[PDB]
Design a protein around this ligand. Structure first.
Ligand SMILES: *[C@@H]1O[C@H](CO)[C@@H](O[C@@H]2O[C@H](CO)[C@@H](O[C@@H]3O[C@H](CO[C@H]4O[C@H](CO)[C@@H](O)[C@H](O)[C@@H]4O[C@@H]4O[C@H](CO)[C@@H](O[C@@H]5O[C@H](CO)[C@H](O)[C@H](O)[C@H]5O)[C@H](O)[C@H]4NC(C)=O)[C@@H](O)[C@H](O[C@H]4O[C@H](CO)[C@@H](O)[C@H](O)[C@@H]4O[C@@H]4O[C@H](CO)[C@@H](O)[C@H](O)[C@H]4NC(C)=O)[C@@H]3O)[C@H](O)[C@H]2NC(C)=O)[C@H](O)[C@H]1NC(C)=O
Ligand SMILES: *[C@@H]1O[C@H](CO)[C@@H](O[C@@H]2O[C@H](CO)[C@@H](O[C@@H]3O[C@H](CO)[C@@H](O)[C@H](O)[C@@H]3O)[C@H](O)[C@H]2NC(C)=O)[C@H](O)[C@H]1NC(C)=O
Ligand SMILES: *[C@@H]1O[C@H](CO)[C@@H](O[C@@H]2O[C@H](CO)[C@@H](O[C@@H]3O[C@H](CO)[C@@H](O)[C@H](O)[C@@H]3O)[C@H](O)[C@H]2NC(C)=O)[C@H](O)[C@H]1NC(C)=O
Lengths: 212, 164, 210
């Protein structure tokens, strides 16, 4: 019983996908709550008001709640996304009085360059068998950012990054924690925190951290 | 010689697509004019089963014992909701009748009628909004809003004038 | 389907962790019409009705609905021992009463470890510097973190939300911002953590120039 008919949700690219030319950023338009009685969905796509035809729509899938869900994916140009072009998904269906339009674009506001600081473990944590390497990334805007770690130039895996947190001056900050065996820290392997953000020169910085 | 009259049942001059509307003529077979072109139909009343936006515009009736009726302007809108009133200009003390009409009369709950951006009246289930006597405080921009199942829908704003 | 709506909110972690404070469960009812505005609250603790709740007078909201609040004081130890609190709301516009239940997050508690981190060498070239308090390995995620120096609270700090770590516990960071002067003079700053799995529900770590 879907009184309101179908709903639409429109998702932006991943930050890393827009910051690296080797990757392909995508805008994702998801129509959910499609009834079995009128399952035909039409997708129109617009960039700054101009229709495009290079979208890729996959056919429907029945859900657990016995409705259909349908996804259309449009790849975007990095420079287009980053220059603030608007992406519009228009979804047509009979169960609606009019077609639903949704629009997304990169977050507005003046870019601010993130400052990256690496912080070694506390003395008090050197008594355990794993230790925490910390990367503080502050003073950035907008909050779209990606953070990775490496050890001696090879990617590390066991790390977690807090969400961006709005700071008192309107920029964001976050922390990233890499957990390493104390052996690897005391042996002197060089760890590095890598930050990708639009306001960085070449969209990329890296800070290093070593015993120490 | 008497000019025929056009009356609408129901009384709303603004409807949504897929509303029904009967336009009756009051004169004396009759002849109907939509956008100044004879249509079709030639029964006493002209009936629209499911309004579309093309059905909008000017209507006139006429019968053998009457002149061409003064025109009536019917408006068809697209949306989930429409604020309807028998008219939009009111003297003081006149009664105000507002209807929050939903597309195809879809069940609508948690309805509010809003004047100048501030919710003025709330009902758990869709109902008409009645102001028994109009004050100058009642002028402004009005619309209605509610939940269609779980979807938060809203109507366009209509201007209400209290003269005076 | 329409009708009023009920939301039931837990105490603040700090209020359950300190004996001098008073924790409270809060039952909020919204979308109460003028036409049927009387709301009855029944309160149950582990299924036994209690009678010490304080119901407030209704208040008209911006959207011309009423909202009405009923507040139940809870004993610290009852909340931390996992008792269930149930608010039951009765109104003429409801077909049958709405019931909501709330209690402390379940799961094995783990003791947070607290580590202060001084500012990066590279940040010392700025007018203001970041003092970091890392709190990790804790469960459940309810926690309070505060800063101070010389016994007085420090205002200019922000704390991340808890993050689920790859071992099932939570961590967060808290960042205090201070003028570089204050750091280089030698003032001691200190990070306070409150969590049910600490001894005395409390611990404290200091941070000073070496
Ligand atoms: C039947 O069952 C259906 C499921 O099978 C169910 O469908 C769900 O309906 C929900 C609504 O009822 C809907 O909820 C919305 O979800 C939004 C977030 O969804 C993402 O995250 C979820 C977990 O948090 C995931 O489960 C979702 O799948 C979705 O996950 C994202 O997916 C995209 C694309 O797949 C992906 O991006 C792409 O990734 C690829 C790689 O995979 C590439 O990287 C691409 O480049 C990239 O584009 C994301 O990475 C992925 N994210 C994650 C985290 O995994 C959520 O945003 C919605 O909230 C808004 O609206 C509600 C109102 O509904 C508000 O309450 C809420 O506050 C938000 O409101 C908006 O806030 C905005 C602030 O930014 C503001 O702008 C707006 O003003 C404001 N209002 C509006 C209207 O926007 C919302 O919760 C859920 O996603 C559906 N699930 C699925 C699987 O589709 C259906 O409901 C069931 N039917 C019935 C009748 O019950
Ligand atoms: C009788 O006259 C009225 C008024 O001239 C006509 O109403 C108009 O109908 C057209 C056609 O549907 C509407 O234009 C449409 O607008 C949408 C929205 O931008 C657009 O996408 C369409 O391509 C189309 O241009 C127009 O809005 C509407 N005007 C008014 C004031 O309602 C009516 O259609 C006429 N009917 C007949 C049978 O001739
Ligand atoms: C359906 O969606 C609308 C649109 O978002 C929701 O309306 C919004 O309701 C909030 C809460 O009442 C309004 O915020 C209020 O603002 C005033 C001052 O501006 C303040 O005094 C209140 O405390 C509150 O913060 C908000 O303005 C309003 N949005 C608009 C555009 O007017 C509505 O609640 C939704 N309804 C349902 C049933 O989901």
């Amino acid at each position: 019983e879907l009184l309101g008919g179908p709903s639409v949700f429109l998702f932006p690219p991943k930050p890393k996908d827009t910051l690296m030319i080797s990757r392909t950023p995508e805008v994702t338009c998801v129509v959910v709550d499609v009834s079995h009685e009128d399952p035909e969905v039409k997708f129109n796509w617009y960039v700054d008001g101009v229709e495009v035809h290079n979208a890729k729509t996959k056919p429907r899938e029945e859900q657990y709640n016995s409705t259909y869900r349908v996804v259309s994916v449009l790849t975007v140009l990095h420079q287009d996304w980053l220059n603030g072009k608007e992406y519009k998904c228009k979804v047509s269906n009979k169960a609606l009085p009019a077609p639903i339009e949704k629009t997304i674009s990169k977050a507005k506001g003046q870019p601010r360059e993130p400052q990256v600081y690496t912080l070694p473990p506390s003395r008090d944590e050197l008594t355990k068998n794993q230790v925490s390497l910390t990367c503080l990334v502050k003073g950035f805007y907008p909050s779209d950012i990606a953070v990775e770690w490496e050890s001696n130039g090879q990617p590390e895996n066991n790390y977690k990054t807090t969400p961006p947190v709005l700071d008192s001056d309107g920029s964001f900050f976050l922390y990233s924690k890499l957990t390493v065996d104390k052996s690897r820290w005391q042996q002197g392997n060089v760890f590095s925190c890598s930050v990708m953000h639009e306001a960085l020169h070449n969209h990329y910085t890296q800070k290093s951290l070593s015993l120490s | 010689l008497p000019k025929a009259v056009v009356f609408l049942e129901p009384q709303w001059y603004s409807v949504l697509e897929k509303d029904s509307v009967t336009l009756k003529c009051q004169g004396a077979s009759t002849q109907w004019f939509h956008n100044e072109s004879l249509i079709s139909s030639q029964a006493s009343s002209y009936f629209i089963d499911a309004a579309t936006v093309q059905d909008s515009g000017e209507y006139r009736c006429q019968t053998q014992l009457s002149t061409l009726s003064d025109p009536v302007q019917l408006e068809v809108h697209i949306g989930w909701l429409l604020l309807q009133a028998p008219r939009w200009v009111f003297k003081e003390e006149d009664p105000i009748h507002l209807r929050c009409h939903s597309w195809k009369n879809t069940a609508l709950h948690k309805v509010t009628y809003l004047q100048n951006g501030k919710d003025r009246k709330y009902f758990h289930h869709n109902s008409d909004f009645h102001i028994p006597k109009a004050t100058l405080k009642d002028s402004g921009s009005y619309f209605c809003r509610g939940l269609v199942g779980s979807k938060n829908v809203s109507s366009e704003t209509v201007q209400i004038t209290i003269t005076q």
